[PDB]
Amino acid sequence: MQIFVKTLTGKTITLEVEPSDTIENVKAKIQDKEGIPPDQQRLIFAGKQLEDGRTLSDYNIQKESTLHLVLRLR
Amino acid sequence: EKCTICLSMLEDGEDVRRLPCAHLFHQLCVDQWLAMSKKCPICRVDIET
Amino acid sequence: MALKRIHKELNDLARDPPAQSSAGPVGDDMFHWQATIMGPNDSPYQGGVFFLTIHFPTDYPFKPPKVAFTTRIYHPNINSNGSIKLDILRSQWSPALTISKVLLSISSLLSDPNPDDPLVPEIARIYKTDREKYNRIAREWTQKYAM
Ligand SMILES: [Zn+2]
């Protein structure tokens, strides 16, 4: 399953994922693709910040859903 | 041409309304609005002026 | 009706999602959404995610959605409670307007406040009389509440 992660830049990075993937995993895929440390990734989808523990499916992320990546700069 | 109120297309064979300002809507769509307001949903020009 | 229109909007958000904001159903009830607004740039909110509740009334789009911040924010037009004094959400509502346009105009509000019609007088005086105090406090609030 392919999803889109939109950054503030506007750049849309694409990810191969499975609904069962943790947000943890997705952040790890984002790190793998674009080099960002997962601790400085906030993922948003449909007004919700995505919690690490939880999964793509139980945020209802589907094929071609677009997440938003904002960075925390901690 | 898309009705800005219902976001469905303005098809041939539908009851449509062009306001004096030249903006098109489904009649049934805009009539609900013109009930509560005499202003064009798109440009806000008053339909009586 | 409302539901069709809400679904169309949502379908359009998926097809072509805005950067700078995100929105959708809190659960399966389509009439209650959440949205995020990224603090507009060239503005003291930059870097903050601001969470909003959107409640669509039963006769949307003919009545505006109730839109509130849940992130606390320093702004002349948002109080604590996160009520928003923005024209299009009251007198200048139009059924031509979408939630994304609402969201834009709230971002627009964040960029350019209306201190002359302020929901929070305190903050309006400061916005005008001392801008850099206003920015400083807004930036501080951002970092405390939106980051
Ligand atoms: Zn219509």
Ligand SMILES: [Zn+2]
């Ligand atoms: Zn018009």
